[PDB]
Amino acid sequence: YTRVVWCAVGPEEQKKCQQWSQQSGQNVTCATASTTDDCIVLVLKGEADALNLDGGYIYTAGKCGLVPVLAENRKSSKHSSLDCVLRPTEGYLAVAVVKKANEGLTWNSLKDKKSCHTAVDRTAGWNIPMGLIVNQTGSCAFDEFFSQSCAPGADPKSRLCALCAGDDQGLDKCVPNSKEKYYGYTGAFRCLAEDVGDVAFVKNDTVWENTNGESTADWAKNLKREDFRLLCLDGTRKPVTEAQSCHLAVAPNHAVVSRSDRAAHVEQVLLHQQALFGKNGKNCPDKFCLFKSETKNLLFNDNTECLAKLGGRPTYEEYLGTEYVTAIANLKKCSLEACA
Numbered sequence: 001y002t003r004v005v006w007c008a009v010g011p012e013e014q015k016k017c018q019q020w021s022q023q024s025g026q027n028v029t030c031a032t033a034s035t036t037d038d039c040i041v042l043v044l045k046g047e048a049d050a051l052n053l054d055g056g057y058i059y060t061a062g063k064c065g066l067v068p069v070l071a072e073n074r075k076s077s078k079h080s081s082l083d084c085v086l087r088p089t090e091g092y093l094a095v096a097v098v099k100k101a102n103e104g105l106t107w108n109s110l111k112d113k114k115s116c117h118t119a120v121d122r123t124a125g126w127n128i129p130m131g132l133i134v135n136q137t138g139s140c141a142f143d144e145f146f147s148q149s150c151a152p153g154a155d156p157k158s159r160l161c162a163l164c165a166g167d168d169q170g171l172d173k174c175v176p177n178s179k180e181k182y183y184g185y186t187g188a189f190r191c192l193a194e195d196v197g198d199v200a201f202v203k204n205d206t207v208w209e210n211t212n213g214e215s216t217a218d219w220a221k222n223l224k225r226e227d228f229r230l231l232c233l234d235g236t237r238k239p240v241t242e243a244q245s246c247h248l249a250v251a252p253n254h255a256v257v258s259r260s261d262r263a264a265h266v267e268q269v270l271l272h273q274q275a276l277f278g279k280n281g282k283n284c285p286d287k288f289c290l291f292k293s294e295t296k297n298l299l300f301n302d303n304t305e306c307l308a309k310l311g312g313r314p315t316y317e318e319y320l321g322t323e324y325v326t327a328i329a330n331l332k333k334c335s336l337e338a339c340a
């Protein structure tokens with residue numbers, strides 16, 4: 001009754017969920033699916049209660065009646081007077097990243113190059129960059145723009161999955177979950193870092209969190225921010241320090257969604273759970289931390305300070321914003337459980 005069933009995407013999130021379940025004393029239980037879309041279906045069926053989603057999926061879930069409940073909030077400089085849970089969200093910056101050594105590569109010479117995407121249907125990894133490319137190109141053949149890519153969620157036989165690597169054994173190539181080596185923010189950046197692709201579509205934070213000794217991960221240990229450059233829409237290339245004047249767009253933060261009829265209950269439980277395992281939670285450092293998973297961003301992004309209330313009880317369209325909503329709609333024109 002007062003119990004919440006979380007939906008984990010893939011085996012790694014499932015294992016973290018199980019630890020959360022155990023430490024929560026069954027207040028939180030786990031359901032697992034192989035893809036985010038499958039988790040959305042479980043929630044619609046009522047077999048799972050909620051999960052944290054990127055804005056691109058919130059659009060999909062929203063057309064099916066699911067609503068945003070609480071949003072990820074990262075530590076910001078401005079609005080320091082208010083508490084995190086009550087602080088308004090600022091959104092993150094979607095950027096296009098390349099290696100400095102790849103001189104001459106600009107936004108205007110991306111055609112026929114190799115790309116790394118977080119996953120199909122995600123904000124920074126797909127919707128924003130492909131939406132821009134389709135317009136500037138006046139063509140819906142976004143599957144023919146880059147020569148090869150790793151875009152988890154696309155046809156494993158297509159060029160859009162040619163660069164994906166699968167798991168340790170080569171299985172699950174291009175699956176849209178953490179089993180795929182180049183999945184998500186971290187995976188797409190790794191795809192660029194190992195020179196598998198020429199450009200990576202991720203967010204500003206990803207670059208900083210995986211460079212200059214911030215990761216300790218084998219592939220990221222020797223990465224330096226100076227060896228990277230951001231591609232601006234004006235054909236320019238800039239240092240990663242200038243993301244505020246060189247990004248593709250500002251994206252709405254990932255947020256927890258649930259069926260409307262379960263929203264109130266999910267919100268209540270989550271607020272109590274973060275008070276216990278959140279950043280300054282009673283048991284985070286010592287026993288369990290909800291927002292930690294060694295740079296793998298499992299269940300929640302690792303840079304999350306807290307889950308914040310929304311204020312203005314927004315619908316999914318108000319949460320995403322008219323700007324972003326129409327962008328997705330237009331891109332979708334090129335392409336139950338598709339509920340609209």
Ligand SMILES: *[C@@H]1O[C@H](CO)[C@@H](O[C@@H]2O[C@H](CO)[C@@H](O[C@@H]3O[C@H](CO)[C@@H](O[C@H]4O[C@H](CO)[C@@H](O[C@H]5O[C@H](CO)[C@@H](O[C@H]6O[C@H](CO)[C@@H](O)[C@H](O)[C@@H]6O)[C@H](O)[C@@H]5O)[C@H](O)[C@@H]4O)[C@H](O)[C@@H]3O)[C@H](O)[C@H]2NC(C)=O)[C@H](O)[C@H]1NC(C)=O
Nearest residue numbers: 075076077093204205206208209212213214215243244303
């Ligand atoms: C693009 O995204 C980036 C990344 O999200 C944004 O940069 C952050 O912006 C915020 C707000 O403006 C800055 O605010 C500071 O946040 C810090 C916490 O992250 C506070 O600094 C303390 O804590 C840091 C984190 O532990 C720590 O690390 C930082 O500096 C050292 C060396 O200078 C490096 O790493 C150290 O910590 C890591 C953590 O595990 C550890 O591995 C190492 O052993 C080091 O000890 C690393 O460079 C890192 O940046 C600080 O040293 C310090 O102890 C600080 O008080 C304040 O709250 C924040 O600094 C930025 N975060 C990072 C990682 O740089 C950026 O704003 C976005 N751009 C735009 C335009 O939006």
Ligand SMILES: *[C@@H]1O[C@H](CO)[C@@H](O[C@@H]2O[C@H](CO)[C@@H](O[C@@H]3O[C@H](CO)[C@@H](O)[C@H](O)[C@@H]3O)[C@H](O)[C@H]2NC(C)=O)[C@H](O)[C@H]1NC(C)=O
Nearest residue numbers: 127128129130131132134135322323324326327328329330
């Ligand atoms: C790709 O191109 C399409 C076509 O231009 C872009 O869609 C257009 O986006 C703009 C900006 O959001 C919309 O303008 C707004 O219109 C409303 C009223 O319709 C007005 O109140 C606002 O002030 C603003 O002018 C425009 O309507 C919309 N066009 C269509 C047909 O939906 C799309 O955003 C582009 N994609 C990307 C990623 O840039």
Ligand SMILES: *[C@@H]1O[C@H](CO)[C@@H](O)[C@H](O)[C@H]1NC(C)=O
Nearest residue numbers: 002023024025027272273276
């Ligand atoms: C579990 O939920 C109950 C009911 O609200 C609460 O009293 C208890 O503190 C919770 N314990 C944990 C570990 O979350």
Ligand SMILES: [Fe+3]
Nearest residue numbers: 054055123124
């Ligand atoms: Fe995202």
Ligand SMILES: [Zn+2]
Nearest residue numbers: 247248249250
């Ligand atoms: Zn801007």
Ligand SMILES: [Zn+2]
Nearest residue numbers: 313314315318
């Ligand atoms: Zn409203």
